[model samples]
Target: FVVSEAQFDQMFPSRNSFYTYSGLTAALSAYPGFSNTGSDTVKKQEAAAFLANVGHETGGLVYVVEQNTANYPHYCDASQPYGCPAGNDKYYGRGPVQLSWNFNYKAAGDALGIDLLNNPDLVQNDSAVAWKTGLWYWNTQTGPGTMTPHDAMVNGAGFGETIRSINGSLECDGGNPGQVQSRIDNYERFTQLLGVEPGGNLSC
Candidate 1:
């Protein structure tokens, strides 16, 4: 792992117990190419970039699930063929990446070989599964951007592209500069912790 347990603790001092270092490390196997691609510097940068987004998503890992109770039921997408077998409100954002939407649960579960579409609660209840979901998105999904977060880093698209791949539609291109800066700040801090330079184009 690019990030040691001590460094993980330093990154999220007040993180919930469910976001365990063991869990994170264990989940790494699900996507071996994640922080393992490219050179040593690139590997560390990818790890930092990913964890920075996770930090921003979960507020330094303090939140195990999305805090907005009112938005819970809205995540269900009835148009999906499988629908929300886990209940309409059960697909709320959870885990390190704060995954949401019934379609997302189905996709991530399919990728991770876990039944998240039918048991979305597993994201919040199981740490390894939770981190795997996060990695699933990082390594595969592009969100509203052109590349996966893993591709953004290893392909030299820089950290800004990673942001664009994750939440660019909402936070990039002056949409919410403060939020973008917050994610950049987390990335810089984590890169520093990893003893690597925060590469160019650090913002979306």
Candidate 2:
């Protein structure tokens, strides 16, 4: 793996106990191509980029679930055919990548074979499940952008596009410069720790 347990701890010294290095490494099997693709530098860059974005999402891994309780019930979309089987409020952002929305829960669950639609709490309770969900999104979903975050790093799209894929609508193209820069800063720090150069297009 590009990131050792020591490197991970250094990245998020105050991270919650729920986000474990063993869990992150164990989830790597869910997507064998994650940081295993491309050159050594590219592999490390992809790992750093993914972790950096995840750190931004979870506030340096300090939060296991979304801190905004008021937005809890808003995540459920009753119009979905499957609806929220777990409950309307149970689908709020959780896990490393903050998987949310009933449809997202359903998709990530279907991809990971975790039944997240019925037991979204597994994301918060199981570290491997949480990291797997994050990997599921990084490898498959493109979000608001045109490419998955994995593609953004390994395909030469650069770190900026990774941000675009993750939160472009809200933070890219001057939508929220501070947040965008925050993600970039994390990427830079992580790449430094990984002993690789942060590539071009650092901003979205």
Candidate 3:
């Protein structure tokens, strides 16, 4: 892949330089386990693969800012006052992947050493901030390490219930079974592209 772990480290050596490309690299490299990438290649592969998937989902965070904005109406939680008011909705989808909800924002902030309550929009436009949030999802169970929502659906877990633990039922991942086909399809495509086995052992 064009971006490797070394590149990621070079990009995000420190949180202070997060907005820079290096910051994003370092941030994403930590996604697998929140540990410094042992090597450059692994980091690049993960970042490239993640960005590819994210690009398909939220259009590289382009539509997210608008989707999170209060103007969307349904997305805005009127109940949330103070730091996360109506305008905070747009902040939901700020990163390259477009993370949503006030709860997730706060959690991401806590993990990344930033106050998400104050700068919710950091999830998107700011590369370092966005990377931090994405890694937060990846490192924690609430992140990619958790079961895919599609699997939850196939097993009959209630819709919206699966992601409830993350952002309090904020309606993630299309919010229904209808959205599952694409997720499975994406998995299939990803596997084929990388020649990977989704569940079968590969390190063997």
Model 3: per-residue lDDT, tens digit, 1-204? 345445434433432332455555556554444322433333333333344344445543334354534444344454665446536444445554457666667667777788876767556556667777666764453343245322332333322332332332323444554444443344344434444433321110
Q: Per-residue alpha-carbon lDDT of model 2 for 1-204, expressed as tens digits?
A: 889999999999989988999999999999999999999999999999999999988989999998999999999999999999999999999988899999999999899888999999999999999999999999999999999999989988999998988756888999998899888989999999999999998998
Q: Report the number of the highest-lDDT candidate.
A: 2
Give me candidate 2's TM-score against the actual structure: 0.98
Model 1, global lDDT? 0.92
**What digit string (tens of lDDT, one per residue) describes model 1 on residues 1-204?**
989989999999999988999999899999999899999999999999999999888989999999999999999999988999989999999999899999999999999899899999999999999999999999999998988999989998899988887757888999999999888988999999999998888888
- Runs of candidate 2 with Cα error greater than 4 angstroms are none
Q: Provide the TM-score for each candidate, comma-separated.
A: 0.98, 0.98, 0.54
**lDDT scores of the candidates, listed in order:** 0.92, 0.92, 0.47
The per-residue C-alpha lDDT of model 1 at residue 55 equals 88
Instruction: After the best TM-score superposition of candidate 1, give how far the Cα of residue 192 lies from its true spot, in angstroms.
Output: 0.7
Candidate 1 residues lying further than 4 Å off, grouped into runs, are: none
